[model samples]
Target: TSHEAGIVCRITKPALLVLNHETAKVIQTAFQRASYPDITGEKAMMLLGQVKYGLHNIQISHLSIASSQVELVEAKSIDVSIQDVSVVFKGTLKYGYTTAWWLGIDQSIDFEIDSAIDLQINTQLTADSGRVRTDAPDCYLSFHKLLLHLQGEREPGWIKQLFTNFISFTLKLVLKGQICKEINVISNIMADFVQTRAASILSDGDIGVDISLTGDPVITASYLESHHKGHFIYKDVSEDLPLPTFSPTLLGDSRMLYFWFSERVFHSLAKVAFQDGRLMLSLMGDEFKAVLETWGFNTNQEIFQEVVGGFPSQAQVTVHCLKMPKISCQNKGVVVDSSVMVKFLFPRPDQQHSVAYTFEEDIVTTVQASYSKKKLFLSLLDFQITPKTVSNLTESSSESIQSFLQSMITAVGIPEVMSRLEVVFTALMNSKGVSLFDIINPEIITRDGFLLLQMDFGFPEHLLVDFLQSLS
Candidate 1:
């Protein structure tokens, strides 16, 4: 079936943004609930076997083949030919003196460590595709085990014990690397599993969200660096409360959107390493502007500055309240007030000034989107609920009712929805429940001819998840 006209074709940034935010909850749950045997001793043997076989069999673990352009080609029935291949090993380590080492002595012990990995893998293919073609001279290159040697000496002076914390830190490096591989395997497995399960859940579900990867996902990582030669001034713009932030979906008609990613996303990925916090991101609007200008989007300097000026080149997204179940249907679960800041890069290229705008409107309740960007953004801002008189209907059970209301508040994160369908079914009841005949003010209700219903709603995280999974 052609998904061309379905979710993939209709996905918008606003929709994805909402979905991303909600889906993060699921990923977190998966990460937390996931378990792996301590990969030490015999456990290491099992894990190593899994990694080796998993890498070979699991398509997601492979270096995805991407060409300059996307294409589909058939493989020849008869294929042959592989060529000679080689591999190399490179390793490096540094040592320093600390207050304490091992055995409570102030002595330096030699710490040796290294990893042997191949530098290259050359495989000749009969069809210039699959590896080890025709049983030709092919090389199965791999990285041998890495060894971490931490030899510490105890400080002669017990006073140095406080500073001896460095020894524990050294051991951490080894353990974290060990756990990381295990996590990578588990996370990849969970993602693939959930992706498949979610696909089946959404199939013919009429929920309008495409819960598939569409194809293999591409994970690209990069590092960004800039030099400061002259004076660097750090200004304090901290306020008692976070500055107000506007939804990107609020970019109305005819408006251009130039996105700038703060270091938040980068920190999420970097949490695994003990590296200095550097401003790294997959997408940077300022950098993008420069690239776009080079490619001819904003050739005119004056026009470019006018649109992007005063807007923040870097800003953190601060969510005041992150607890779920805050917007249940009963007893008025709503976010009364919330806002975040958007700080501009000081001394903007055009010497632009910063303006902090406070977003005070009620959380979006009803929403609809056109195929265009503007409406898509608005859909992200909010969505319209049917049966405007939703509060008038009766729920099947109190638990079911609460789940239904919660559903309106949260789109089940992947962790929540991808579980057993019966569990999801019950959870949906909590989120989707509607209580009728409540003494709600007339102003809050939507009126159509004879149809009377409450259209006012709290932002449901689940809706965002549902919407996104519906799209490819």
Candidate 2:
């Protein structure tokens, strides 16, 4: 059955809970409680400072999904630290739903997850089940050891300082507990909504998007699954493609993943890369260029030199493709990967859109693009289907999930590697710079069913410069 078909609740380890009506109430309380302190400034200033510090300072210097590990660097520290990070966290989210039928009728219960999270806090609630559990090991707030710094003596005097500390600490404790409890409630509510919505959407056979943030990253990770009939759209555009080809086999529908990594994300990374000179793009450039050109791209021999000498503020990618002659509509499969020219679209335009080229076993095909607006729309590209690839898929026989996912990932392009910086920077710049939530939320958005979540933290631009300087 499909996710919208409504499945059983599956809550994982460290996460303890059964499917029940109370689940929704629990989750709502948790979010409200967990988020309350941030508004009140209850978390330690030093910890808050760390949040700010980590947001700008942490850099994913390297990503190797094959090895399932990521290398990160502290912008200010030269000594790099390589910590193991999970690429995807797998789990199922279950909830009930009302207005399930076409007439906005009654309701039903359901459980499922679109994508696994890097963090998870799941609670299963069935009509016959109850209670909630957590997957976090220990909720320990660790900050710099020296909590007290005699910078200018007690500013508001000893009495005032004591009173403030007590209020903050007490609030923190209350919030943590209250938030966890609320989260449990929300999960159930979501389950109900999802259950009904899943059925409605499945029957409606329409396309839509999800924007819920997962559980308290520490308390409970959020998971949302969306099911759509085999139909795709790009900024008000949809092709007359077949169903199986568009959705997944198990889903009995076509499916694809959309990742929203913005330019703001890049600004953060570049700020650090520039400081360490470890940006390593020079070394990685050839590999990236090879991948692009290997498919088909024309290169400006002195492009790298030009970029090296030009303002570090700019970024560019040029493509070179060989046009085939006397090509007919049916000849789409006859095209060859001649060459793609790579360069910086000079004058540094604000936004540009380009049709994505699908990557086959060893071929490239242009899908769609728009220069006036910087938006991208792509579809099934070069993909592989093997025993290892399809082994984990729960439903692979319908149309074969292996080829389906392969086409999605390959066609979509790996944003974090090449395009992430531009996207991240774009979002941050337009929103009055980046802030703390930008960093923490990327992990959260993946769960809500939105591949990309824009965070306008309204951080100061000057801070961006200062943070980069700290790296040097």
Candidate 3:
């Protein structure tokens, strides 16, 4: 079955504008790139004259934005309001006249443009192609000052009057079209960059988490969210785990970021580790002897005499998972049920084994997980191991030996396995740089069917700086 995992990051309005610092830079880039090209056209005046003019090499210099504000329209889009973006334009205007019979002389004069404009961009976030998509369909530009100037002598009073009456209006419309289009392009590029970078963070070599969008992004007055299809990819093979039903009530409105994982995700990870032969342990002959001694059992005891027939100093013990571990989440904690096989070998270094014992166990454990200082911590709350069957034992004394084996497994096997697991999991999370982010007051909660991690974070200044540098 195809499964999905969800991550919702809620940043309040105050925090949203904190990141808007970078957005201001993007807006500035748009203004710079909206360089006005030469506008050469003809317009016929009813009473004055038929004027032919060209606006040459118009350019915006010294642009300053007074302020910017962001608004979230529930279930729709993000709207931005830019107030009083003061700008200056310098260029030249050339005009020529034509009488019915004679060709009129051409003239040129330098000019300037100074304006304070307000801008609004409504951006819609969508998941149309299994990825974040942006559309800026509603954009408006309003002008407060659109003054034009001319240099070198102004002899034609009608020419100056004509520019004020008709030229400014046409210029405003052209500016609106070009600037808004540029902003739309930049917004899309930024969205793609974020998606690509986020995917990179979730991938490690052959192991990857697929975060393809599953639904349209949502926006509300307080926060913005995205839904994802979180499938696990191993060795180029993609497999879905069981999905946990989610509701908004599972999350709160305070955290800077939240990550929710279904119990199936944990099970899938464990299954992959088991299949890769990672869930096994070996104890040498000496080590096995020490374990028996520590449990107050002697190797020469009567229980082992029946199976070994002699004092067993040369022995090797191996324990391995026989089946995939079943994992589930509950209000209490994470529970695991697994089947394991233990084998004993009694042999000389160069000769074959004299005797051996093998048994199967059904093991159950409850686990609790936490994170701090960039390290993952796991505690085994409780464990139970029961012998399912015994082999290579005489019928007369099989029951006694089986009881002894159970005691030994309970004393050492479960603890050793859980210890190794704690190490592996902690290492894996640290390797992913979980500690690098300045996460504050992180809380890990085990809920019905799933787990959640919520935390406030100091703005990762270094990360943002690096990303901005890359953009440059």
Highest lDDT: give the candidate number.
3
lDDT of each: 0.25, 0.27, 0.73
Writing each residue's lDDT as its tens digit, candidate 2 over 216-244 gives 11111222122232222223243432222
Candidate 3 clashes between residue pairs 3 or more apart in a chain or in different chains: 374-435
Model 3, position 318, has a per-residue lDDT of 91
| Candidate 2 segments exceeding 4 Å error | 1-189, 192-232, 239-317, 320-339, 343-472
Cα lDDT of model 1 by residue, 1-472, tens digit? 1111111111122322333334333323322333322211111121112111010110111111111111111221111111221111112222222322332322233333333322121211131111111211222223343343334633223212321333224433433343233334433443345434433432222221222222221111111111101111112111122112222222121211121112221121222211222222222446534434434454245533422344435321111211111111111211112111112222233332321121111222322212121111112233322221122112222344333333422342111211232343434433433221121221211111111111122346665455335433
Once fitted onto the true fold, the runs of candidate 3 whose alpha carbons sit more than 4 angstroms away are 1-17, 33-35, 42-60, 89-112, 148-163, 235-243, 271-320, 340-363, 387-436, 465-469
lDDT of 3: 0.73
Residue-level lDDT of model 3, residues 1-472, one tens digit each, is: 1223444444455546656665666677788767587877777655536668888989886788988888888877788998998888888888876442244577788888889999988999888677888998899898999887777657565566666787788889889888888898888887887777666656566667677776677677877777666665667687754455556656775776777777766776676667667678888767777766766777788766754445466667898889888888888888888898998666533333345568898889888877777666677788877778878532334566656666667766676676667777667656765556687878888877888787776666566556545755
At residue 147, candidate 1 shows an lDDT of 40
Worst 10 residues of 2 by lDDT: 50-59
Residue 291's lDDT within candidate 2 is 44
Residue 469, candidate 3: Cα error in Å is 4.5
TM-score of each: 0.20, 0.20, 0.71
TM-score of 1: 0.20
Cα deviation of 30, candidate 2, in Å? 14
